[PDB]
């Protein structure tokens, strides 16, 4: 149920394919939605989750460089997919920016995204 | 054990008192060390820890306003005191800055500090 198009609360789009071998591949499109706003993602997921009604663990990375721009940073999302009625992916993320040594303390931000199959407004 | 003067890897000073009631009170002094660089802290700790070798959980908050300046932010440190030879307090911290709603998603930095009694 992972494969498909997901949207987070800010309107970004996560286009993902879940491979039989545990691979996640796809495209992350920021809310602006144009050609300059598409970035490659790669990740991994639990391809044989527990049958006790637990979620499916997964993670992925985007480095914020494409042919139009480079933000010298990367964001990882760690979370789980929860299937059923209104499926969702619940995640927490870390965004680290390349910095000098003296600036390593503003290098990493933390936050949380919820992805659903429905786009919000 | 906890009560004392502590230093992080960067040169800040953590001056704390651990009360019988579980309270942490004190002052956080940034690396500069002048009067403008002292901030009030308050926190809590487990006053009856396990005796199985486990550390003592604790946390505290600094809001980055004193009588001289205001950085419209607050940092919380969450961690544990590990006593004995070479006592340490190992922590992870979250720094949140006041932002508008449009900028919330970039409001909080995370990082880690280790405090020792030797500077």
């Amino acid at each position: 149920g992972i494969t498909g198009t997901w949207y987070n609360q800010l309107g970004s789009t996560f286009i993902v394919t879940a491979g039989a071998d545990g691979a996640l591949t796809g495209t992350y499109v920021t809310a602006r939605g144009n050609a300059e706003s598409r970035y490659v993602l790669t990740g991994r997921y639990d391809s044989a989750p527990a049958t006790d009604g637990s979620g499916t663990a997964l993670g992925w990375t985007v480095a914020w460089k494409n042919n139009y721009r480079n933000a010298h940073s990367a964001t990882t999302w760690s979370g789980q997919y929860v299937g059923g009625a209104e499926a969702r992916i619940n995640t927490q993320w870390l965004l680290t920016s390349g910095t000098t040594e003296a600036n390593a303390w503003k290098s990493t931000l933390v936050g949380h995204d919820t992805f659903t199959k429905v786009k919000p407004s | 054990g906890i009560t004392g003067t502590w230093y992080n890897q960067l040169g800040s000073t953590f001056i704390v008192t651990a009360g019988a009631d579980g309270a942490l009170t004190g002052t956080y002094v940034t690396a500069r060390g002048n009067a403008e660089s002292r901030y009030v802290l308050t926190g809590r700790y487990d006053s009856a820890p396990a005796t199985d070798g486990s550390g003592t959980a604790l946390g505290w908050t600094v809001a980055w306003k004193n009588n001289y300046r205001n950085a419209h932010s607050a940092t919380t440190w969450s961690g544990q005191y590990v006593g004995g030879a070479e006592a340490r307090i190992n922590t992870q911290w979250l720094l949140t800055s006041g932002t508008t709603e449009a900028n919330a998603w970039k409001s909080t930095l995370v990082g880690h500090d280790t405090f020792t009694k030797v500077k």
């Binding site: 003296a102 303390w105 503003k106 | 960067l10 040169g11 800040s12 940034t30 690396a31 500069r32 660089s37 901030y39 600094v62 980055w64 300046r69 950085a71 932010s73 940092t75 720094l95």
Partner: peptide, 6 residues
């Protein structure tokens, strides 16, 4: 930021 001032 004060927390990291040198």
């Amino acid at each position: 930021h004060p927390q990291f001032e040198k």
